[PDB]
């Protein structure tokens, strides 16, 4: 049972021997400095996060023949070559995703070295979804992740319906709120906030619904948040690392 | 049994003994990345294949005298020259064709004189074996063996009457793309060429007003069936292509 | 399928991965020189074949936990320490047996262990397959497909009854070496191996006295006839042999 | 038309391309020096040509394959592989011999690098042989070598014979000789003397002939050699250099 990495499904692994995977450790920040002359000190005016750059080190494990490497290559960058982000994990790291796509290659020096240079528009990595019931009152969530996260609601209707909110609060103050004037029974609200979408009964997409620009949800990492909704709801949130 | 390397179909390892050949491994993929102050993360914006470098490391084996040598190298320099790309070709990878030119050479160091080759190719792709499938006047699915996408050459010599003919990539029962022509006659052979854009008849007269809507050009994804459909028994040939 | 390595019938390779085997290329001489004082030049008193040296340099794969490399390691310790010469195979080189045994690793530097595994070979000679020929009442001309002399073995299935069996080793109609052997009777099978030194009977019964006067074990010189004659149909069978 | 060296008259060079050829430049020489505490200098007590080390540089060519590889080595085990001095020659040297035989191999580090490692007990290269006609009068012999040599005398008999001799001389002073009772004619007496033989009319060892340990002859380089025998003879010598 050997290191695996896992490129879009694909166990690439099956191909090559994996030495070194750089890109995981502490995750450095961009920072705008701004500079006057005569002025002591320096002014950030700017911080993000970089995409990220994971480095694979492998060994790609010949066939004995010349022509079976050759071929073998040319499959390996069959496995690679993708136009869109990918599911990139790793054995070592369980409950973790990365997505991103290969980039580039730098050849290295008995065989063959290779450094395999994998991008990430999105730096962090996603991990388990978490699924907590949110009742009538002022029920605390906590964001079981490192970093801030966007949390799915869903309400499937016992009773009839006029108004569905999704109250946000600190305290007894209501933050931020999700407000739908489109009622009914039986059938299942869905309120994504990383793909931003308004699901029903079975499906369909309840766009105009969201009736004033009603603020998008955000759970703060190893913190309570306090949601109270109309009807007996629950909160799917997906654990996030840098 | 050497190592052979051919050049426009002339046999270079007459010339000299190849060392290594670089320039064939995990390509590489160059991205345009956008990134906003402020804002986390990245965004990949355009995304192309590089033109390929073949790097041969190379051992120009003398002939004992030094005019010898001088003279060997002039006509290697003769052989090398090319204004126009040509097809490359290594022993060890058969079933494979490589479309460059020579760029340039970076010499080395005793009764011997090592040498880097660089050749260069537009075409970033080897190019092998073509495969010929037969196309239907019903759903065909046609297998494109290679590992890159292909764009093929549908050919159709006619049985019966003409007065459209059409080639369609459907998805089931949905034509997603499709290719007509207003031209119709028997008993001669017509030829679409995705790769050069070509309209062809028997003696290989150009149609070009054939492509009349933006009925496009369609191409052959890797390691997956393309479901083509006709209007008179047609042949497709299509040529397996790899990174 | 990746390069496999045999030792004592057991896969090592299913413990580590093969970077590169030294120890099989141009074999060299242990060589006895003398020099006297104001005497040009030198002269050799003895010439022999080194022991072999077989150097593979491995990974050990680790089995993600480190308390499963270190027991992987204990078990590779148990499949390696061997006490007596052992069958060495590598894929590379088929219909190829080395004989030896691991004797000293020498250690290495991130999340894989390499590792040069020293095996000793008291025999220095590789041991191909092994070739019958049938040996006739004339001289018989038997061929060592071998690249080294080897030491044959003689085996004959009797007829009719016998006196005295006789195997001479000829120069054209001139006995340069012969084997003899005074104890005669007809069914059974007869066996002199000139590698083990042993006399056989049917049950395989020691007859020592059976090479009587210095009727000396000969050998199969390589890619040349060696001519033979018997004094009932034999069966010759050697084992081709390299450096 | 590539460089070749021949080892017992194989052609090693259809197994191997040769970068260089080290051990055919300047000889060096074996001195014996002996020195005393308090006494200025040192003194030389013997010198001597050490034996010839000559040290093939050469890459083995693959054949593709590794089996083809490890089989190709295995043959080259067994051109290599002698228990008997032979001749050896390189292309660039023409009308040269060395008598040696392959000692070992240094593996060195894309291909198949080898030091190849020939001793010969004689240091001497070996050129083309010269015939010179002798008279029964004092003829100059020059030996065009660079090394002392060791000459074959001929003589076939054109009358009868009694005591044929060849002497050597300084102007007219007998400084070494060769002696031989037995006469006849017709036939050819053969007095070789780097394998020390006497052969007769068609080649039969006449040994007891050699009547008073007459002194074996050398010829001197650069310089002639005056020779004079009683029946027409010829004086065969191979040139040979350092």
């Not at 010949?62 to 073998?72: C, F, N, V, W, Y």
């Not at 008995?110 to 999105?122: A, I, W």
């Not at 703060?220 to 997906?238: D, R």
Request: glycine share 8%; hydrophobic share 35%.
């Amino acid at each position: 049972k050997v290191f695996t990495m896992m490129y879009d499904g694909q166990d690439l692994t099956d191909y090559f021997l994996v030495q070194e995977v750089r890109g995981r450790s502490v995750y450095s920040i961009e920072m705008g400095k701004r500079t006057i002359a005569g002025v002591d000190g320096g002014v950030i005016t700017t911080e993000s996060l970089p995409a990220r750059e994971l480095e694979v080190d492998a060994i790609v494990f010949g066939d004995g023949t010349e022509t079976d490497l050759r071929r073998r290559i040319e499959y390996l960058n069959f496995l690679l070559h993708r136009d869109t982000d990918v599911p990139i994990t790793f054995s070592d790291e369980p409950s973790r995703t990365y997505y991103g796509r290969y980039e580039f290659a730098t050849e290295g020096d008995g065989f063959h070295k290779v450094t395999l240079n994998f991008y990430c528009q999105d730096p962090l990595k996603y991990g388990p979804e978490v699924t907590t019931d949110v009742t009538t009152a002022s029920t605390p969530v906590k964001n079981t992740g490192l970093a801030v996260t966007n949390p799915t609601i869903r309400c499937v209707f016992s009773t009839s319906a006029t108004e569905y909110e999704m109250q946000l609060l600190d305290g007894s103050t209501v933050v931020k709120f999700l407000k739908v004037v489109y009622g009914f029974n039986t059938g299942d609200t869905l309120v994504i906030d990383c793909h931003e979408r308004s699901v029903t009964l079975n499906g369909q997409d309840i766009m105009p619904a969201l009736l004033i620009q009603s603020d998008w949800i955000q759970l703060k990492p190893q913190v309570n948040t306090y949601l109270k909704a109309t009807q007996p709801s629950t909160i799917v949130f997906t654990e996030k690392f840098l």
